[PDB]
Nucleic acid binder design. Structure first.
Ligand SMILES: [Mg+2]
Ligand SMILES: [Mg+2]
Ligand SMILES: [Mg+2]
Lengths: 549, 390
DNA sequence: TAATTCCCCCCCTTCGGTGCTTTGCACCGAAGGGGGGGAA
């Protein structure tokens, strides 16, 4: 029946009461699925019958289980969840098959009726009351209260997870050679014992679980490979994702694109080279959830490439603690990176991608460093150690960047791999003024009220220009003024500015930015073979800045 | 048992736990298992909504792991003197009195806030949650309770060498006695069985101007900007009589001025620059802010102040050349050194403005931390104001 | 017309905090919205 495990004390927030939401009418099919379920659990003491002494109520309904023949009973505990005290979640992440070591024998078990086998605090049970809406004589409906953990309650997952750990602890304290992966009520049991001894000790585990009230039905007891575990197919020496089906639609709505992108981020954990940026670019604009977006040519090629990749079968491999993890990174382009973590060449532990664009202004080196950080954190999560990187950036370029950059940057041990395209910096700022080149004193200022401004430059050789900017800003006026100097000068320029904002934007060597003005500035800087940028304060009457301003 | 209450109107810490490495997880499991064995901690369930991060560190010449719990949010909401001449000594020494708190039980009503979660590799098991039963480490309330016996347990050694001005902060004792190096080790060795740095060479870095003869237009511009920026810090900088010299649309490399009144003005500014800025008094009520800048080849510059441009202390930390490519290690060592200096001088841990991205610091700072306490920090983004503090 | 919960990942959008450009831009980090994945 139910477990003899102790009940976790649960209380409500101070000055609150239980829900009193009247049950909504249910369709004829779902009442017969509920009276059956309630009759079955009422005999076992899982739910008890109550009378007029309990005023609280909560709606109930039912969905179809993954078996597609049995019904799952749920209670809409949203109000009670609002008035229920807070819990700390003990589930910290999803186990990954790449973190699994090769085991001689493996068995996957599922506890039958996991929540219904764990008792619930007595002084809380009255808040879990509900009514079954028989649709015969409209009334009377029969009223029950839960005696076990109900599905739909916010505290049920945390309570169950911490209760199942206490049940598995006595078994694990005396079987250190057995590895038990516990997710909810799903158990993956691995051992190096032979098949006979493994099965014999598995039967000991199933007896230990049954002694604690948790049954393990034989229909959910897996004994032969491939094992369907946590969305993966586990063979003796490899693992794959369960088959992923992509929609084949001639007209894509916002939701369909959203579904397709989600199914590609999931497929990218083992398939290499999955690109989704073009597909996700159609989701910009808050276009409802039914609006039909035609596929652009740039977003069609990415879809064709992603469909080609998924045609071939791709397998993973298991972890080997003795060897070392090697992570290799490639630049796809437009701020997209792919990475493969493996131990042997062409045998990937896991593949992934990184396409985040942090900050308005950034270059290749910062994105590579962020990708390295993400891979390091993920590897620490999975394998508990930092891998060794094969980066496409040269040691000279990284040395120059980290010596010249004003912020503390560091990446773990890595080696250079000659994989085109290579990460590089497209221009550098001179540390000293250029002798023989024209010196430009540039300045811009925009009115605060009507948002009209003037930006211009003056040269030491007798060449000044002003262009009035409409619908502008004080800082963007400075950016335009700097851009003006680059446009009408030679291959070598000395440039003197006045704004700290332009200094901070420029001297970080950005390559791409969210604004077109900075992109044009970067292009002009790229075609300039020597540039110097110096800052002078404002309103000090400094020589040179007066003529432009 | 001292009843401890939170700040009026505050709640408990609810911080998540960052991922840890395999060695750290194993060490944490062993340590928590033993402290549960003699009842320093107790297992708890999810009905406790409070949580603080935890990890493990290796201290100097110990090779054994030590548990470090991040009681930073709990300290800010707990709501419970400095040695006047601790810096007057020359050989202050740090002692780790951290296991003495495990003998005073924590009050029952407060234990729920001292909860932490140990994760697992590859998430093979839900994280195991524990709560403290005795006075923890890293909590700003443990010294406040242990003091009533901490005084009685040092009273003997306090009348033996009357030259010992001591301090107890967080989990460490700063002992300062103005004596020779030979006597101090014997004095320290006496102290440890009784229970069983360099605070006089810290010099500020004055603001300086470049020295040369050929002052180019760019050089004059940089010097004028430096003087204008420093005028806020040092009242008296006029820079007017030099700004009146740079007149015209001259090129960026012409050395025009050489010998005029500009030399006298530069000398006048140089003379007033070598002063210890009168004022800048330490108010024992405002928060201490320490800002750190990276100046190239393994050099960092730190400024500790309460309000801007009024620097309580300025300094440079070099440690070693750029041989350590590990910028995070150098930054961590600098942070620890600055924190130790602040506790020695002012007795209050500052608030740091680290010049590093959040992800890099949060990923790598645990690998090199070696101190029992943790300072509060934020992350800046000040592209070069063009030297200035060098 | 079905309606719930809890975790992990992704992308996009709003909005508040902070600092300098200073009372208004520029930027960044949390929270929410959708979508995948896992379980009850
Ligand atoms: Mg089950
Ligand atoms: Mg299950
Ligand atoms: Mg299942």
């Amino acid at each position: 029946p139910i477990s003899p495990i102790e009940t976790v004390p649960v209380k409500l927030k101070p000055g609150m009461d239980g829900p009193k939401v009247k049950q909504w009418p249910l369709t004829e099919e779902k009442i017969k699925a509920l009276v059956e379920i309630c009759t079955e659990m009422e005999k076992e003491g899982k739910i008890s019958k109550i009378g007029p002494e309990n005023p609280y109520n909560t709606p109930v309904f039912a969905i179809k289980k993954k078996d597609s023949t049995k019904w799952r009973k749920l209670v809409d505990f949203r109000e009670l969840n609002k008035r229920t005290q807070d819990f700390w979640e003990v589930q910290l992440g999803i186990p990954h098959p790449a973190g699994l070591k090769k085991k001689k024998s493996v068995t996957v078990l599922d506890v039958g009726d996991a929540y219904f086998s764990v008792p619930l605090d007595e002084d809380f049970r009255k808040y879990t009351a509900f009514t079954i809406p028989s649709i015969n004589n409209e009334t009377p409906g029969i009223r029950y209260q839960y005696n076990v953990l109900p599905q739909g309650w916010k505290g049920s997952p945390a309570i169950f997870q911490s209760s199942m750990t206490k049940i598995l602890e006595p078994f694990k304290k005396q079987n250190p050679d057995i590895v038990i992966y516990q997710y909810m009520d799903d158990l993956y049991v691995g051992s190096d014992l032979e098949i006979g001894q493994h099965r014999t000790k598995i039967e000991e585990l199933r007896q230990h679980l049954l002694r604690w009230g948790l049954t393990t039905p034989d229909k959910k007891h897996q004994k032969e490979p491939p094992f369907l575990w946590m969305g993966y197919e586990l063979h003796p020496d490899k693992w794959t994702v369960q088959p992923i089906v992509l929609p084949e639609k001639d007209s894509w709505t916002v939701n369909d694109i959203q579904k397709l992108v989600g199914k590609l981020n999931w497929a990218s954990q083992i398939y290499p080279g999955i690109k989704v940026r073009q597909l996700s670019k159609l989701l910009r604009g808050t276009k409802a959830l039914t609006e039909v977006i035609p596929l652009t040519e740039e977003a069609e090629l990415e879809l064709a490439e992603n469909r080609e990749i998924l045609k071939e079968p791709v397998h993973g491999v298991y972890y080997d603690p003795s060897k070392d993890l090697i992570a290799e990174i490639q630049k796809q382009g437009q701020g997209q990176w792919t990475y493969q973590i493996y131990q042997e060449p062409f045998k990937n532990l896991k593949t992934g991608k990184y396409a985040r664009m942090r900050g308005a202004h950034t270059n290749d080196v910062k994105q590579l460093t962020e990708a390295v950080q993400k891979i390091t954190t993920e590897s620490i999560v999975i394998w508990g150690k930092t891998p060794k990187f094969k980066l496409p950036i040269q040691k000279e370029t990284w040395e120059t960047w980290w010596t010249e950059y004003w912020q503390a940057t560091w990446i773990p041990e890595w080696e250079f791999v000659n994989t085109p395209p290579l990460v590089k910096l497209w221009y550098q700022l001179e540390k000293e003024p250029i002798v023989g080149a024209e010196t430009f004193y540039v300045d811009g200022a925009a009115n605060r009220e009507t948002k009209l401004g003037k930006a211009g430059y003056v040269t030491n050789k007798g060449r000044q220009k002003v262009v009035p900017l409409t619908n502008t800003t004080n800082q963007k006026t400075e950016l335009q003024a700097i851009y003006l100097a680059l446009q009408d000068s030679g291959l070598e320029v000395n440039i003197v500015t006045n704004s700290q904002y332009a200094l901070g934007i420029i001297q970080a060597q950005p390559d791409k930015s969210e604004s077109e003005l900075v992109n044009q500035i970067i292009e002009q800087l790229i075609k300039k073979e020597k540039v110097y940028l110096a800052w002078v304060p404002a309103h000090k009457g400094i020589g040179g800045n007066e003529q432009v301003d | 048992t001292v009843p401890v209450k939170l700040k009026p109107g505050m709640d408990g810490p609810k911080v998540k736990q960052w991922p840890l490495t395999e060695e750290k997880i194993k060490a944490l499991v062993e340590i928590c298992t033993e402290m549960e064995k003699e009842g320093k901690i107790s297992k708890i369930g999810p009905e406790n909504p409070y949580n603080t991060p935890v990890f493990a560190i290796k201290k100097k010449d110990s090779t054994k792991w030590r548990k470090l719990v991040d009681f930073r949010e709990l300290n800010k909401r707990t709501q419970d003197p400095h040695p006047a001449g601790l810096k007057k000594k020359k050989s202050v020494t740090v002692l780790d009195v951290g296991d003495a708190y495990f003998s005073v039980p924590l009050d029952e009503d407060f234990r729920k806030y001292t909860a932490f979660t140990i994760p697992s590799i590859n998430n093979e098991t839900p994280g195991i949650r524990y709560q403290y039963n005795v006075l923890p480490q890293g909590w700003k309330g443990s010294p406040a309770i242990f003091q009533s016996s901490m005084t009685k347990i040092l009273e003997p050694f306090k009348k033996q060498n009357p030259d010992i001005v001591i301090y107890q902060y967080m989990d460490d004792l700063y002992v300062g006695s103005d004596l020779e190096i030979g006597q101090h080790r014997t004095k320290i060795e006496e102290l440890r069985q009784h229970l069983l740095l360099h605070p006089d060479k810290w010099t500020v870095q004055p603001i300086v101007l470049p020295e040369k003869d050929s002052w180019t237009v760019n050089d004059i511009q940089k010097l004028v900007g430096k003087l204008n920026w420093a005028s806020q810090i040092y009242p008296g900088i006029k820079v007017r009589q030099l700004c009146k010299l740079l007149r015209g649309t001259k090129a960026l490399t012409e050395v025009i001025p050489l010998t005029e009144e500009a030399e006298l003005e530069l000398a006048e500014n140089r003379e007033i620059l070598k002063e210890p800025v009168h004022g800048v008094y330490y108010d024992p009520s405002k928060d201490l802010i320490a800002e750190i800048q990276k100046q190239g080849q393994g050099q960092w510059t730190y400024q500790i102040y309460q309000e801007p441009f009024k620097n309580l202390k300025t300094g440079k930390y070099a440690r070693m050349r750029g041989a350590h490519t590990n910028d995070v290690k150098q930054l961590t060592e600098a942070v620890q050194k600055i924190t130790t200096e602040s506790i020695v001088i002012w007795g209050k841990t500052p608030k740091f403005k680290l010049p590093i991205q959040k992800e890099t610091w949060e990923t790598w700072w645990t690998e090199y931390w070696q101190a029992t306490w943790i300072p509060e920090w934020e992350f800046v983004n000040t592209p070069p104001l063009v030297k200035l503090w060098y």
